[PDB]
Design an enzyme around this catalytic site. Structure first.
Site, PDB file in Angstrom:
ATOM      1  N   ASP A  47       0.900  -1.134   0.000  1.00 62.16           N
ATOM      2  CA  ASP A  47       0.000   0.000   0.000  1.00 62.16           C
ATOM      3  C   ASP A  47       0.943   1.187   0.000  1.00 62.16           C
ATOM      4  O   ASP A  47       2.121   1.047   0.299  1.00 62.16           O
ATOM      5  CB  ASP A  47      -0.860   0.002   1.271  1.00 62.16           C
ATOM      6  CG  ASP A  47      -1.722   1.274   1.425  1.00 62.16           C
ATOM      7  OD1 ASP A  47      -2.370   1.713   0.438  1.00 62.16           O
ATOM      8  OD2 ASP A  47      -1.768   1.823   2.555  1.00 62.16           O
ATOM      9  N   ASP A 105       0.290   4.872   1.310  1.00 64.45           N
ATOM     10  CA  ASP A 105       0.291   5.722   2.489  1.00 64.45           C
ATOM     11  C   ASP A 105       0.522   4.957   3.786  1.00 64.45           C
ATOM     12  O   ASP A 105      -0.170   3.979   4.076  1.00 64.45           O
ATOM     13  CB  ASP A 105      -1.022   6.486   2.585  1.00 64.45           C
ATOM     14  CG  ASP A 105      -0.827   7.899   3.079  1.00 64.45           C
ATOM     15  OD1 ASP A 105       0.009   8.614   2.470  1.00 64.45           O
ATOM     16  OD2 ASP A 105      -1.499   8.292   4.067  1.00 64.45           O
TER      17      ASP A 105
END
Lengths: 207, 205
Positions: free
Chosen positions: B5, B7
């Protein structure tokens, strides 16, 4: 290109910040707001001189004896070393770890040319000490580093952030990277093996 | 081989998301502060509006454009991204995965990831960027010899339910569905990944 020799401050460790924080905490303890602006003006200023400027902002340059200012300055330093002692691998300057990777992945010898007696301790605290194959014990502290790495100075780059260090690297006949130097980057993240290669290639031609 | 992912793992765009909303709040002239920002972590827009006392002020299609302008503003601010905004262990972790031809993947919700990855200067180190628990699969498709890393309970379970080993970045109960849990991105190195993986790998057979 066979070896890269590092110095510690502003190159591997964010000592500068740690000096900022040092100064700050003392200021809390002395009830004077500190901030980075004041800090940035006090760049290159005597330790004793810095303190007097902080004291003058707090209208307190008269409140304290020399003796007490001495102890003040002594604490700053213990704070600093204390801060340096709690170093972790998250404290490694941006770009650096990845750079080491490339140099190793490419079989370039890696060295350290720091005046600090605690360097090995610190490189360990940072989890990168296995990357170094030569650490010099406290000019030509650089020529020693190259001796230890078994390579000519002509074939090494040294990365540095201090006026003096760059003089030393140059006098020591090496390609000097600043962060009056042969190649200059703004921040450590700007250091790629790729830039290093290219610029170093050019450097040696111009001679 | 390994998936991220964006962030909380590769970088932190929080500040930008914040600013982005705050420009909207300002355009509507409704009080907005970082406290709210956190609390509101479309429902969101209504919230500021309801809070702002302007719950009737905007249509839905207008409201939609108020959002379009925001994605646009955000998409700009992240221009301010430099490799200096790469997270601690990451850059190196990446140069290593590369060296050992382990494959590198982005399964992020982010709509701007490609620009984000390019500002970070790592975008070449990837080979699968997802384009919108399906997601990390889609990524794998782009597969149980797979690692993925998250910083949220959500991402975490989406990963395990995708049937891989899930590496959590963070701490607490938010973390208790993870194979591995490092307290920060630095702790995570190609070594530690390997050692803890072959142990997961075995426990399968």
């Amino acid at each position: 290109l066979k070896a890269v020799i590092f110095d510690l401050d502003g190159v591997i460790t964010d000592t500068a910040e740690y000096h900022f924080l040092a100064w700050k905490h003392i200021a809390e303890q002395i009830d004077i707001p500190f901030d980075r602006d004041m800090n940035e003006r006090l760049k290159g200023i005597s330790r004793e001189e810095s303190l007097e400027s902080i004291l003058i902002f707090g209208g307190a340059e008269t409140k304290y004896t020399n003796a007490e200012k001495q102890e003040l300055m002594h604490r700053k330093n213990r704070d600093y070393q204390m801060l340096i002692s709690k170093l972790t691998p998250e404290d490694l300057l941006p770009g650096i770890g990845r750079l080491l990777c490339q140099l190793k992945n490419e079989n370039i010898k890696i060295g350290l040319a720091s005046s600090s007696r605690n360097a090995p301790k610190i490189l360990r605290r940072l989890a990168i000490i296995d990357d170094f194959h030569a650490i010099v014990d406290p000019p030509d502290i650089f020529l020693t580093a190259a001796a230890m790495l078994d390579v000519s100075p002509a074939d090494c780059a040294a990365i540095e952030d201090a006026e003096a260090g760059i003089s030393a690297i140059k006098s020591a006949g090496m390609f000097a990277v600043g962060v009056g130097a042969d190649l200059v980057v703004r921040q450590t993240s700007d250091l790629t093996l790729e830039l290093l290669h290219e610029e170093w290639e050019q450097y040696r031609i111009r001679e």
